[PDB]
Amino acid sequence: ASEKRPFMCAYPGCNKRYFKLSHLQMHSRKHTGEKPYQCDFKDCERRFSRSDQLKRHQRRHTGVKPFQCKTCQRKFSRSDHLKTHTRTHTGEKPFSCRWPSCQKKFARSDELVRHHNMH
DNA sequence: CGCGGGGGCGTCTGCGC
DNA sequence: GCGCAGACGCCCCCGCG
Ligand SMILES: [Zn+2]
Ligand SMILES: [Zn+2]
Ligand SMILES: [Zn+2]
Ligand SMILES: [Zn+2]
C-alpha cells in the first residue's frame, strides 16, 4: 500500500486487485473477450463482447466473405466455417459415436450431438 | 441428414498506450 | 508493464435441399 503495491484490474464486476504478475496477466486476457461493443452499421443496435465478434457481425451486414475455399472457391465469412468445410475434402471425421451399437463418425461436434439425438 | 451460416466465448500473440 | 485488439478455434443452434 506504499512503494510496494498489489496488481489491479479495471474491468467491471472484477476484484480489480491481484497478487501475482502472471496470474493477473492471464486474468487480463479473460476480459479481452468481455469488452462491451455495439454494431457500427447504419441501421443496427446489437451488442458484442469483443472486437472480433463485432467485426464478424459487420460481415453479416457487409456481405464480407474473404475466406475462399482453395478447392470449391466457395467464399465463407469465418475461418471456423472454412476449416469445417475444409474437412469435407479432408475426410477428417474425428467425432465418432459412443453408443453401444455404433461407431459412426462426424466432422462436427454438433453433427455428433445431432446423431445422438436421432440414435 | 449433411452442411451452410450466425452467436457467444476462451485464448495465445502481437501491438499500442 | 498491462491492456486491448486482432485473429484462430470450438461449441451451440437453426435452417435448407
Ligand atoms: Zn478483471
Ligand atoms: Zn448490426
Ligand atoms: Zn471446398
Ligand atoms: Zn451412433
Side-chain angles (χ1 to χ4, degrees), chain A residues 66-108:
Chain A
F67 293 95
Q68 179 174 316
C69 171
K70 56 278 108 64
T71 8
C72 293
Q73 312 318 305
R74 186 167 185 91
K75 290 183 179 67
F76 299 102
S77 50
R78 311 212 306 205
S79 52
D80 56 78
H81 286 356
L82 179 140
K83 187 173 183 291
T84 291
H85 166 70
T86 294
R87 293 196 287 281
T88 316
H89 329 87
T90 317
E92 190 174 285
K93 302 201 299 170
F95 298 101
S96 61
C97 193
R98 304 93 193 270
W99 274 62
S101 74
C102 184
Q103 283 296 273
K104 291 182 289 288
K105 317 197 188 303
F106 304 87
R108 290 160 55 163

Side-chain angles (χ1 to χ4, degrees), chain A residues 20-114:
Chain A
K20 281 286 154 284
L21 184 140
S22 309
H23 121 139
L24 182 256
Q25 292 338 274
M26 186 59 189
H27 164 64
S28 80
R29 263 86 280 237
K30 190 198 71 178
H31 285 321
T32 68
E34 301 180 303
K35 191 266 171 287
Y37 278 101
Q38 75 299 272
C39 188
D40 309 305
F41 180 60
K42 191 179 73 69
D43 312 281
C44 189
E45 58 84 67
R46 262 47 61 171
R47 289 77 55 205
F48 300 96
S49 82
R50 189 162 47 223
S51 329
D52 192 35
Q53 270 80 283
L54 169 53
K55 185 189 300 84
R56 178 191 300 194
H57 178 71
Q58 288 320 293
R59 302 180 201 146
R60 185 178 181 32
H61 282 300
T62 52
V64 165
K65 294 173 298 295
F67 293 95
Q68 179 174 316
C69 171
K70 56 278 108 64
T71 8
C72 293
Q73 312 318 305
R74 186 167 185 91
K75 290 183 179 67
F76 299 102
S77 50
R78 311 212 306 205
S79 52
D80 56 78
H81 286 356
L82 179 140
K83 187 173 183 291
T84 291
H85 166 70
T86 294
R87 293 196 287 281
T88 316
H89 329 87
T90 317
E92 190 174 285
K93 302 201 299 170
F95 298 101
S96 61
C97 193
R98 304 93 193 270
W99 274 62
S101 74
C102 184
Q103 283 296 273
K104 291 182 289 288
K105 317 197 188 303
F106 304 87
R108 290 160 55 163
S109 49
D110 48 304
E111 272 187 329
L112 178 60
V113 175
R114 177 169 291 185

